[PDB]
Design a protein around this ligand. Sequence first.
Ligand code: CLR
Lengths: 50, 221, 283, 335
Amino acid sequence: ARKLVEQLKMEANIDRIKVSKAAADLMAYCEAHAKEDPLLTPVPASENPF
Amino acid sequence: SAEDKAAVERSKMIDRNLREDGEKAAREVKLLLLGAGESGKCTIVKQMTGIVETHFTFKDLHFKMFDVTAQRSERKKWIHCFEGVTAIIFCVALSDYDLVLAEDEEMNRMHASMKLFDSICNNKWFTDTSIILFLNKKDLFEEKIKKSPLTICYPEYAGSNTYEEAAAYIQCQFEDLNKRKDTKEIYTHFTCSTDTKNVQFVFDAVTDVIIKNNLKDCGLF
Amino acid sequence: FNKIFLPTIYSIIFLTGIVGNGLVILVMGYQKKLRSMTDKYRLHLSVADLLFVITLPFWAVDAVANWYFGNFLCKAVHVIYTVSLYSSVLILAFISLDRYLAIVHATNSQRPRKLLAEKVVYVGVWIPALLLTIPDFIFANVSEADDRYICDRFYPNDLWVVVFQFQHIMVGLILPGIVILSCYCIIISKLSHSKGHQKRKALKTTVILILAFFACWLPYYIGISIDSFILLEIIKQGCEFENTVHKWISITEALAFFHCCLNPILYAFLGAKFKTSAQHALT
Amino acid sequence: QLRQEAEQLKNQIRDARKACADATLSQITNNIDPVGRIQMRTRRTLRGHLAKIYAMHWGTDSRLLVSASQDGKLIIWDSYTTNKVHAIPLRSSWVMTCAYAPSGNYVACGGLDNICSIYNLKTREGNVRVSRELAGHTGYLSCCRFLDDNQIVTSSGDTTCALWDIETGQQTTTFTGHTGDVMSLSLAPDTRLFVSGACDASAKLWDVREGMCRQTFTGHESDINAICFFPNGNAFATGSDDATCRLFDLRADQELMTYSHDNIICGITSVSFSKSGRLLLAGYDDFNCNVWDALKADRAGVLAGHDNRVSCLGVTDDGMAVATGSWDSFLKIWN
Ligand SMILES: CC(C)CCC[C@@H](C)[C@H]1CC[C@H]2[C@@H]3CC=C4C[C@@H](O)CC[C@]4(C)[C@H]3CC[C@]12C
């Protein structure tokens, strides 16, 4: 289990940011690209290929 | 719209090649081979890398045999791919009742085979799919039954150590594992030395399966 | 008796026929998956029975009050009646032949069952029904009797009546009857010995089909045969025999008409696969 | 000896993960307005497959898609006009995955044959021919994605994922560490990392260049069947057999939100995001596709149009449409 122990040690020594910051960044991306999502706000049927 | 008309024409021709290919495939018999100890690569393929497909034509009927021995991964993740095969050829070595697994010494080989047969027969995908049962090494089993009693596997076997009665008892033990007796059938054959009789049995069993499928399709029941 | 019984008995069928045959059409219309050979036959049968069903309300009105719709409409309802009546029994015979091919020659009959299905269904079903309607076009006219207008198949003499009744019996009863009997009796024989559950269900369903067809169409054509023999002077009895034979024809004609509502039950609703298709179409 | 050290390292990792969990995503997503009832209706029904459809992949142009089915055909459609552009006959009719090259010149394949086959879509003659067949996997090949015209990463049922060089047909890098069958795979937008969800109920993040497991994610009770990065590549969502979808953040190195309902008891076959990542499309065994709100776990729509289990699902790069294939042999474009 030397390889498993080494992998666990390698994965333990990483920089973890707070959940609040990650969620805030995720939300910021979601609203930043909100207008460009054709599935949230439907596009006019003139510019709809389907 | 010359380009668009060309595209529609090629689409119609490929769709008309797809339909004929589908007809050709529907005129085919697909059999899935399974087995526990010897894995099913027995005389079933001798008669005539992940999956080995064997093609043979018998009496104007074309069969496709899929051997899944090399798939050592988890079966529940790909066994639904075979939902729709015409039948399943399960292979059981008769002369394995007194043998044991090399992986587990306390596990009976024939018990493991019975457990596999039970597990696949009652699988949710194979509810309407009939099973063809092949019992191999009938002559070796007959030779072996004299020296050793058929009790290492069946302590409840209340019968003589005769080939006929013991073989019938084993066949009944396998056939009793079919929970859903009314929607699928189990065809049992004692595979013999001649290879034109095993394929004849498979042909007859598949013919019966196809007749029942047609009865369901034609609305007759 | 006559006024009350006919329309009442000709409305039960219309309500069941329009619903039963309509349900099969919508299920087949709203079917995503590919059609089988029996599905196409079932669509043909549904359309033929639907034509017959929409034909009935005119006969019911006639029974209440004799024909006053016109003379062109009489020919239109006679042609539609003949098309539906002949096409229904011919489609039943074709279904019988298809099932014979599927059960007896299960493995080596797939191209024949589709050549048969499309090509031969149109050639051997819809074309001869239209040819049989051709004399219906020539001899269907409105005639006044006493102070009442009745329209039916009027002929120059009784010889034409007899020959057309005989050809009616032959086309309707004999050719579909022989094909359905021979094919389903060969089917039952191959399913009698087997003790499988599904084969037993299929055997009892096949027996039901034979009994339904013959019990529906036999008394009517027996009465027609007796009437034709009466018109040929080969049988001579009192006038009460003629009137009773006519009342038998009129009473068993409705029993024969029951086919256009029995067929959706026997050929569509009894099957399990069609039940599943109907369950999907419903959702 | 080593077991105690492994347990101590796992406990330390769990403590570090718990320390970073200051406020949950659900706690801080209450402020934003919920997404309204998302109603998509089937625009095109791509017909022509005669068996279960097991995978599909959109093109980069967002017009052409390739679909793989058990009937042994790999069909490239023209979703705009429903025309079929190609229909590739496959050596093995046991396809479990398919991919479409970003350049559009090649399509991948694979399944129970353990072989990933590359087909050259653009040939001088005008037909399609097998560019190369990649062999070396021991279990069934469950996923494959093109990094570019020359590199393809495949996940297999032998618990390993491999990176291939299509020019020479050799495994440039083999990724090991999963215990169960690796069932899904997703590439990052920059194609520098990829995640794989396996039957060990765990997801792992891999470095394509270096070749080791950067991070390991757990929390699912059952097998993981689907996986997909968030559009910005800092998060991914997994679909499992326990009727739950969960969102993991790479930087936070732990789960943020679970997308589950008591009415849903069947596993997830496929997951995908919208162009902005706001909607988490997910295909289910209950014959239906459920549209989730990635930020607040609320259902926002149901794409119920398939007679059988929805096996595959994808969203175009421009986000115009979503395509769902299913075991009833039909693909449907929703918009
Ligand atoms: C007006 C009368 C006399 C004409 C007879 C109508 C017949 C010929 C027409 C009416 C409805 C048609 C059917 C309706 C649709 C289908 C689907 C097609 O893919 C197979 C044939 C089938 C089943 C058609 C065959 C021909 C059909 C039965």
